[PDB]
Write a protein that binds this ligand. Sequence first.
Ligand code: NA
Ligand code: NA
Ligand code: NA
Lengths: 136, 135, 136, 135, 136, 135
Amino acid sequence: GMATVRLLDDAEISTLPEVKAVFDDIRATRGSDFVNNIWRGLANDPALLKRTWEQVKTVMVGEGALDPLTREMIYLAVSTANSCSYCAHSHTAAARAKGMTPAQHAEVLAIIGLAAQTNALVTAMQIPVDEAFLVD
Amino acid sequence: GMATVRLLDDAEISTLPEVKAVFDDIRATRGSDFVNNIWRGLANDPALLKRTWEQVKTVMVGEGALDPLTREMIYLAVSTANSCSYCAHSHTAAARAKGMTPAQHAEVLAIIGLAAQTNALVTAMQIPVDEAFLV
Amino acid sequence: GMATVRLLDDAEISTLPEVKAVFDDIRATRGSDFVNNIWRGLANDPALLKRTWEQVKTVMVGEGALDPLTREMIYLAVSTANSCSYCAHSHTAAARAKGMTPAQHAEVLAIIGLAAQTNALVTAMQIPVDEAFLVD
Amino acid sequence: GMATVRLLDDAEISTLPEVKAVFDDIRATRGSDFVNNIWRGLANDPALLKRTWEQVKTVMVGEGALDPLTREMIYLAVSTANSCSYCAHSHTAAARAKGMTPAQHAEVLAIIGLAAQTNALVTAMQIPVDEAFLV
Amino acid sequence: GMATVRLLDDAEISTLPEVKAVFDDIRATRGSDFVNNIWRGLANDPALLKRTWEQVKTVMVGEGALDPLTREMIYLAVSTANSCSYCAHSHTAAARAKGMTPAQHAEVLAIIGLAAQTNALVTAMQIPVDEAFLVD
Amino acid sequence: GMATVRLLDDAEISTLPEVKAVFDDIRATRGSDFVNNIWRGLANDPALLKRTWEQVKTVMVGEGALDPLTREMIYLAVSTANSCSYCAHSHTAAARAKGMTPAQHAEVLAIIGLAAQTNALVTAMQIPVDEAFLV
Ligand code: NA
Ligand code: NA
Ligand code: NA
């Protein structure tokens, strides 16, 4: 296929208790029977699959200091700066599912573009850290 | 110096009308006298200085989609993923000044670490885009 | 095509002695008549093609401090961190050809994910280098 | 300070039972008293500290696919390609402590430089994936 | 489609004065009726579209310290180092349109490869900045 | 030290015939006695030192497609986008020594910032490649 690993289908996963447990938890957690490809590739290693899902579930689900949409927008900006194409798609879809409006999307993009610009400029100028930033 | 350009000080900026216009605008906009070093470096090219500041005002300052703190936390996240040291400092400072609490900072860091990991894993596996995402 | 440069075929390469010399050496070295696309794009500039191949041959082939499989796993991790999609494919194939097991692959992935995480966290925290790391 | 978070010292960690549990576990695991600064930064968020340490133990410590040194050299390579200065230092130190010799270090650097170059060249040419790799 | 945003067509754009103004300026500036996809995705947010185009027009068009071809080659090298696949294509096409020869292209590639190599080596070695570089 | 390898000084290089050959060649090539620290780090692996220098001479030095300054400015741009601090310094210095003026430096920075922004925006939107670019 196009991944460097096999993408496991539901039929195979039902024969793999460790993997089925994780996939059913994803579905129960997300409120949808759709589980996206990232998980189907991680499924080749049950231990990694569970470590990754447990993190995602802890960080991105439940009460916390930031609302779920805000968390997805941060995830989307990070995915972009890391130039992960799949991640740009999945987290844009997830942001939309968590209520991201066109207006909000446009602003997220604007920030990602501006930040990339100023980051590059700072790096080219080798701006030293202001001493005011270093006070305890 | 330590930068690859000179960092213009206030004394020099006094006699540079196009540049003082921006520094005045920055100070008038942030309510403070302190202008950080990025701007002092950009000041070598008054046009680029103006363009950069205009973008920052439009995107970052005022009524808009997202609150100022949310914008700043997205800005911090980008700065980290792009590996810019100065920028991590500057935008951690900005987010705090815009009211980022310890609790919020901890969750931003957790999201940044987690996204770094999944991004890396997806890239290694070369996961193709779900047809669902394309409809 | 899809590359920003032409991909040279065997028929054309046989008319180009400088390029044919390199391609035949790749085949002799690798023990296979298959030469992958990277080389076919580099072939547009014979000098660059030979500089690149000579490096690859020196670093990745022959006795050295690390075994060939270990070298490919490092190459694969680097390719990933540099987000080169083609390189993720080619070096996963090369790692497999050099004996990488499913278990080993899963561990390489695990390290790449964990390292990306801790690298990001360190960068966000701007952790200063421990003085113990700086002793001569 | 120089970090964007405080680096908890042993005195503070003494009275932080969830955090001392991890520092004790780290020390008990590495056989040494020295815990590097990354952990002291992570200690501000005891949960993230625990999660990060659990991953490191599972992936990096003990019987597994690859020897500990090989794991460390892959970790070093990633850290370099991601451009993390602290991490280059920390994992060069770890690899040496796990027995990386001058000769091995030189070859890792050579591979890292070479991969950087070919990755860059492939990206510029936008080489499509061979159909062979997809069967 | 394949973008995470809609790509606006000419028919729709003619109903959107703000967006049509920008697109016609691109065409007038570039001397061609072809406007590439980046602009059609930015078109979902007129304000961002105009901010981006105004920058591009100011920096990349008109008299300045560097000739237009040189500007495109720098843009292409940056795009590559940022691993933006679309940008590698568009700026290679733009460089060619501004007169880039095969010989020049090969040299740009050579520099991009070499720089990526030395940058990686310096980073792995953590080479400290020579004091000679720090004199005012 | 501050580097993860030792930086060989001229005294050590005196008695290292393969390495002095390169340092002599570098100095003979640049017309100057000053050899920057990158080479002193590479000198730990004489073979890698030689390979790296051979590439630099072939690509960067002499008659070729592009003038030496243009090559250096492309090299600077790459170094910035790859986020290498030392390299930003070294290649800003090289470009100046090869005649980069304030005006040229300002435009390089402007291009680097602009490309960073559009690259980021294209990646976020996942713009597909125009069929025009593929004919
Ligand atoms: Na002054
Ligand atoms: Na204390
Ligand atoms: Na000495």
